[PDB]
Structure formats: C-alpha cells, structure tokens
Amino acid sequence: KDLLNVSWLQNATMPYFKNLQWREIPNEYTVEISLNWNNKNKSADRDLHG
Amino acid sequence: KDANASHPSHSAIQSLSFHPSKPLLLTGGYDKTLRIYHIDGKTNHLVTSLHLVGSPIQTCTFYTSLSNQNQQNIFTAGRRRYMHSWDLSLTAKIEKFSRLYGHESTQRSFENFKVAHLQNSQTNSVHGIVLLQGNNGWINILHSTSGLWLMGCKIEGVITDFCIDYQPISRGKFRTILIAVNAYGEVWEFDLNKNGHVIRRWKDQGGVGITKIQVGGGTTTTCPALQISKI
C-alpha cells in the first residue's frame, strides 16, 4: 500500500534497490541513480596536481 | 558467450586472469584500461573497469593472502618503470610501487612479473612476493604488502622466463622454489624461503632459444591455494 520497491543490478551482479513512494510520482517517471562513469580517481592523500 | 561482448576492448589482450575463489575475470591490455568482468555461461558483464593513464599494462593478476584471505590485491605492470597494486573494495585506492632499494640499474621495464607466497620458516609470516625480471640475469623478489626489496637472484645468461614451485614440508610448513631459464636452456632451481642460493641446476635437452617455462600439476600462480595446508 503506497510503496513500490524496485530492484536493479548496479554492478554486474549485485542487486540494489529503491523505495519509491508510489501515488504522487508523475505518469512517466525516470529515476536517476548515482553511477561511476568517468569519475577521476581521487586519493585521500593528493591534491589536484598530485 | 564472448566474454568481451558486454563492454569491448580496443587493444590486444596481454593479460588475462581469474580470481582464485570468486567468479571474476580480469582483462588487461595495451590500451591501459584494466577491466574486470563477472563471467558466467549466459551473459557476462563488467563489474568495474579501472583506467590508468600513461601506463600501457603488459601483465596483471589477482592476489590474495594465504593467511586471512581478505586482501584481494591486483598487481599490474607494463613497459614503464613502475607497477601498481590495488586493494579491491567494490572508488579505488591503488599504490604505485617504484622504490627499487638494492638494484636500480637492472630494470628497463617491469613488464614481466609473477606473484608468489612464501613462509618465514622461523615464524610463519606467510606473505607475498613480487618477482620482477631484469635485463642481464636479474630477477628481483620484493614484498607484496610493503614493497621492500627482499632480495634478488642473478643467473648467468639472459633471463627468458621463470616460474614458482611450492612444496610441502610438514602439516603447516612449506617451501618455495624459483625456476629460471636462459635462452640457452639450462635452468636454475633455487629455493627462496631461505636466502636465494642455487640448490639445483640442470639443462634442457635441446632448444637454441627457449621462450617460456611453466610449471603446473600441483598448485601454481594460475591455480593458487587458499588454506596453507591446501598447498
């Protein structure tokens, strides 16, 4: 009742979830998710110029 | 299914490895993007894909510690004078080994290395070793956790390749041996759990230039053990 849980494989085999509240989202609806695409690997020890 | 088909590669495939227990394949080529796939018989996908600029990698492999099995360090190396270690933790933290302590004049490259366990044999601090090739007759055994030069070994004549053979001693003790060849094809077989000094040496029946030596049957680099008694 008024909750929708969706599931999707984030990496190649690990299932992530999302609990969308259901009645007040629009008719068509896209869910953005955070996803590493071209993220610069930043150390916990170096600045911009390293 | 073609294991590159989900996210393809562009250069050649100069290194290809498996995780020792987890269902994971590693692919590494000259386009300096080491990918890792989750592989299965139907549709196999890309778990992560690390890219590292300015370092076209030649050989790269998985490694787990024998003691507590929760390390999962990739090691990768190309034609340059630095190699990289990685503790994989499902944003990555990778270290760049370049500190050559004893010998600094024998590596024009890091492009051939193996990884191998060893015991301490007075205590039992079972730990890793990177084994890098050199240029004259040099192959240097480092540490895998720290990065210290453990020692080195030079054979007479040009190194072409080498491999690692373990053997059990007691219930809980074992001994590692390094096998190395020339192009001429007379091999040195020396243990390196004590200091690296030759305990056997013989000669292959033939070959003018031999290219590649590989040991197998028991455990090795490609089939590693998990418990120390399982070696």
Added chain:
Amino acid sequence: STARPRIEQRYWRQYTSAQLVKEHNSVTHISFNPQHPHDFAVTSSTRVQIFSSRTRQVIKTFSRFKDVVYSASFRSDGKLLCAGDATGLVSVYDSYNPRTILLSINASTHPTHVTKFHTQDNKILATASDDRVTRLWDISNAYEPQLELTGATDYVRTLSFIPAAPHLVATGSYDGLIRLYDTRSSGSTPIYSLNHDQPVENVIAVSPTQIVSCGGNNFKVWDLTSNKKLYERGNFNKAVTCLDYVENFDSPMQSALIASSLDGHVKVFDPLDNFQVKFGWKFSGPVLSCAVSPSTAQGNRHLVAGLSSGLLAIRTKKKKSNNFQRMMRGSEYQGDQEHIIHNDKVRSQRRMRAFERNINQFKWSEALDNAFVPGMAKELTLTVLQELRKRGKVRVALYGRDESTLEPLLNWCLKGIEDVRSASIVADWVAVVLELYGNTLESSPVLQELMIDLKTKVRHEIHKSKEAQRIEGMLQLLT
C-alpha cells in the same frame, strides 16, 4: 615528504622578417581582400602588384596601365578589383586573373584619385576625380552613374562608406569639410558636414557610429549620430598620411587602428581606451602608405609600408609497419567510456642546469666554475652569487682553491662592481676571498695586478657614486 624549491609591446615587437622591396616610384596606397586577406595589392606606378601571405613577393600583377595609377580596391566579396589612374579611365577587372580586363569605364577627364566599391553592395562603385563631383557608378550598366553626387567647394579626394548604415557615404575634400551624403537624396547636399581644418588626407569609418578623419599634422574623430568630436591626436612631424583599422585580433588589445604620418614611426592607437599608442616603430624615411592586414589573416599577419620613395617594408608575424602499429594500437584511447580514471603523473619540469644541480648536490666548486664562464648569462651569474651567499658558507665554498681558480671571480667583479644591485655583494665576495687568502697573493704576486686595477676603477666608481649622491642632494635643496 615534498619536492625541492627552484630559484602588449612584446606582442607588437615579436613582429619580424621585415624585408624590403624597392619599387620604381612611390606607393600611393594599398588594398586587402575583405573575405580573406591572404593576398594584398600595392599601387605602384603604371602597375598594381599583388602578393601572397606565404611567398612574400609578387604572385600576380598587372602592368598594361598607360599612366600612373592611384587607387586599388577589392570588392567585399573579394573576386574582382578596381583601379583608378591618372588618365581618368577607371578600370575594374577580376582578381586572381590579371590578364583579363572586365570593364574600363571613363570617369571625368580629371585623374581619378580614389575608387572603392560599396561596402556591402556588390554592384555599385564610388569614384572620385578632380571634377569636384563624385560618382556612384553601377557596374551592371556602366554608362552613367545613378548619382551625380555634387555639392563640393573644391577637390573631392577621399571616399568611404558607413559600414552598417548603407545610405551614408562619407566623402572628404581639400576644404576640411567632411561631407556625408544620403544615397536617396538629390546628391547635392549632405545632411551635415564635419569641420576638419586641414585638407583631409583620408577618412575611414571605424564604427557604424564613429569615423576617424585625418588631414594635416593632427587627426580627428567624428561621431555621426550627434555630429560630435571626442578626440584628436597630433604628435607627428608631418601630416598623418594614411589610416587603417582592425577589429578582433590576437593581442592584449581587442581592436586597433594605425596612423602613418611621413615620419618613420607609425602609431598604433586603440578605441578600447581612447587612442593611445603602445609603441610606434620607425622605418627608412617618409612613410606614405602603411597598413597591417585585417582580422581574418588567421595567424600569419603582415604589415606593409610603401614609402614616398617607394620601398615596401614587409614585417610579418607567423605563429616499423602495420603489424607493429597493430601491436601498439591502443595508445590514444585515454579512458573515455569506462568507469574510473587514474592520474599519477610526475611532470617533466623546466630544464635544470648543471650549476643548479651543483647547488642541489652541494657541488659548490663547480657551481662557482659554471657561474664564471662566458657561455652562461651575466644576470644568471649575479643571481647564483647572491643565492649561494644566502645559502652556504663562502669559507667552505673557497676552502681549498688557488688564484688560477680565483681569477674569473675577480675578472667578473671587475665589471660587476659597476652594477646597481650587486655592487656591495660582489664587494663582499672579494672581501671574503682577500680576508682569508692573503698568503696566496704573497706567495704568488700575480693577481695583485687585478687588485690594483680594481682599486683605481673602484676609486672612479666611488667618485661617480659620490657625485650622484650630491646631485640628488641638489634635488633635495631645490625641493
């Protein structure tokens, strides 16, 4: 851990390759291709010469004129070109093909001084001779102009248009009196006249709102929307002969305009901050026709100077196998469509030098030696002497040397005492070496020749410093 520490006018003076080509007579004025000025024309006597941006000599020319020719002008499309002569039969003919003549139409029998096309229309051409009337001929039917643009007191001599405003033609005569006619008018009156004083040399319109006229020993600006002057400049020996304007080029000045004034130097003002020169560069005498190329010369950019003698000065700025390649194919991918990207590069820095790494490895002796050689720079020597005095002990830097090593130090302090910023510090240098090395000069009596030579020139220099101090004392008294 960390690393180790390390211890405008320039744009218009990086203009070089200034070559000379002497004509057989003076250079009236020049032209530029408006869509792409990679070629340009100069108006020699009885020929027009056209040059490229690459070979820097004549790539084409026309020389079957019969009299001295005055005006060369491209149309805005940059395909054909007009030329007015002293005969008064103004000729238009196609450019990039000299040996054809499109149409040679007579103007008035007076010498047609200027002739330029419409700035945006491709079929109407303005001519002006000494008939005290200028004409807007139409090249479709070149039998009579549409406009007999009369209304002059004497000698209409320089034409221009207004760029964005089409119907306004700004002509200039030898009366001051810059007229600007409407092309829909009767052709007898301007709507107003601009009051220059001298006979105008030529006028251009640098804006759709502001024109600049030049005539006599000062040039004027003129607003057209309100009939206003905001500016003059007159720092020239003779009258400002020719003008030029450029917009949106590669400099610390967004747009420039130059005035050339028959006195060697040509001046580069700017409508960014009301008409100041950066620096003007001289030439070899009376500079009559001088201009740089317009905006879309694309890097390679030429200034030309045709003097009243006739020599053109041109100064230009100019900015295994398949199987092995397939073996090393993946070299340019650089991480585009995959997850994370590492970057851990050390940078190949500026070229560290031998004296610098001598300081880095405490190689003080050969650092001194690399300082005192003629191959190295003088200010580099001053800076390394200052820095090694500030860094290290001069005693342990000179702990074992002799006079054959000491002599370039004295030989360069010989000329470096006269410096303003390193005088007392190189005096401290020779003070330390003579403070601890008297035994060497009393064993070998050689280098006291340089000591006494040093003494007499430093008495000269201390006299010079004393008299300079008392002259600024004169300033202090006459404060």
Added chain:
Amino acid sequence: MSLWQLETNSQQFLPRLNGIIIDCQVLGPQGNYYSLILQMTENNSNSDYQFLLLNASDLTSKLS
C-alpha cells in the same frame, strides 16, 4: 628518512621531511606502516613535535 638494507649495507632515502626526525619504527604486523615523529626546530622555544605515519608502498604520508 634513511633505511639501510643490511645485506647490501646500502640505503633508500626520503629527502625533505621538513623537520628533524626524533623516533621511528615500523609497526605493521606484516610491516607496512612506518610511525615516526618530526620536530622541525625552526623555533627553539617549544618542543613542538609532529606525529605521522607513512605507507611502505610509495612512502606517501598518511595522517600527518
């Protein structure tokens, strides 16, 4: 920071620690972390030390 390999009797350096090293050891159980104390006596007034450890991998300092 100078570390000697004994069976060559030679050394790996670490050049600019911007101070004066007072105490140092390795303390990883497999030996991956060097704990040490800097002091940087550019002011002689106070014994103002500086605790830091660094990895054995590329000798990069973690948590000064």
Added chain:
Amino acid sequence: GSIKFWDFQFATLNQSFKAHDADVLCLTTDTDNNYVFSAGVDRKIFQFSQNTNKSQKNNRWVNSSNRLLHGNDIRAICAYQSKGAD
C-alpha cells in the same frame, strides 16, 4: 667495483656488493675464510665478514667495515696469519 661472490659448484652468483666506487684490483682472505679484504683504485681497503653462526649457516657476507688510509691507489694487497702475528 662490483665485488661479486660466485658459488663454485652450480657456477652461479651468490652475492653482490657495489660498494667500491672504482676499479677493484686485489683482494685476499685468511685460513678458514672468516673474512675477505678487498682494495683497488678508490684507495679504500674494506672488509667482508662471514664469522657468525648465521653467516656460516646461511653462507652470508656482510659489508662490515671500510677504511681509507692511502694516497692514490692500491695495486696489490696480501695478508698473513700466525699465532704470533696477524
């Protein structure tokens, strides 16, 4: 300068020391090989030791001591031992 110790049987290297900074020219030892003393044209005589039980079990040599007491070069050394002199 690379004083290299090779093993007799198996014809292999055993250790290396690039401690000499010039051309080595001469080197000697004692009766049961507890030491080896080398010298060359760095005018430095230096020692390597194999005395302790760890060194004689693992057959290991340490660059024990080093000593410059010369002016230009070495071109010959030799050594002698007795119970009256060493």
